[PDB]
Amino acid sequence: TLFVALYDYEARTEDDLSFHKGEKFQILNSSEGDWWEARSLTTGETGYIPSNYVAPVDSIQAEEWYFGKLGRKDAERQLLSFGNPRGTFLIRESETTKGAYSLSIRDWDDMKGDHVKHYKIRKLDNGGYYITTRAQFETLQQLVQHYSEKADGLCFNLTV
Ligand SMILES: [Cl-]
Ligand SMILES: [Cl-]
Ligand code: NA
Numbered sequence: 760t761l762f763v764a765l766y767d768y769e770a771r772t773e774d775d776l777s778f779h780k781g782e783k784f785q786i787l788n789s790s791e792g793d794w795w796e797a798r799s800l801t802t803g804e805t806g807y808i809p810s811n812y813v814a815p816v817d818s819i820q821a822e823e824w825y826f827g828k829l830g831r832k833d834a835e836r837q838l839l840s841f842g843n844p845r846g847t848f849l850i851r852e853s854e855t856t857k858g859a860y861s862l863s864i865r866d867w868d869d870m871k872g873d874h875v876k877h878y879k880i881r882k883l884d885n886g887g888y889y890i891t892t893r894a895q896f897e898t899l900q901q902l903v904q905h906y907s908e909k910a911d912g913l914c915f916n917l918t919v
């Protein structure tokens with residue numbers, strides 16, 4: 760299972776690798792702490808990388824729209840950045856229910872101007888993830904794909 764760089768990183772020691780976001784790696788040793796021995800799949804070089812800078816290639820952490828540990832207010836601050844159109848979104852962990860998630864979407868209306876709507880993503884015990892009783896999804900990726908086509912109850916369509 761490959762790992763993917765979530766951010767750019769510049770070597771800080773002789774034994775560290777430098778890499779750009781999206782670069783792929785094979786992990787060789789992840790047992791001697793926060794710094795893992797890896798092989799770059801662009802240069803073939805072996806060295807140490809910060810573990811918090813990488814995630815498994817098919818993980819939720821690797822998704823462009825997933826911002827795990829981001830809070831509600833900082834989600835608003837991030838989506839209300841310049842250039843993000845109506846429908847720009849992100850998925851983050853729920854601050855109220857462990858194992859639940861939150862879908863934050865940039866929207867616009869008459870009373871509030873540019874604002875953000877938050878939708879809690881729950882998970883059924885013998886089922887998948889859902890916002891409505893209408894549909895449930897085995898993964899968060901499938902949920903994003905579903906609401907990317909039409910809003911289906913949501914304030915606006917997901918701009919992916
Ligand atoms: Cl970066
Ligand atoms: Cl850096
Ligand atoms: Na991500």
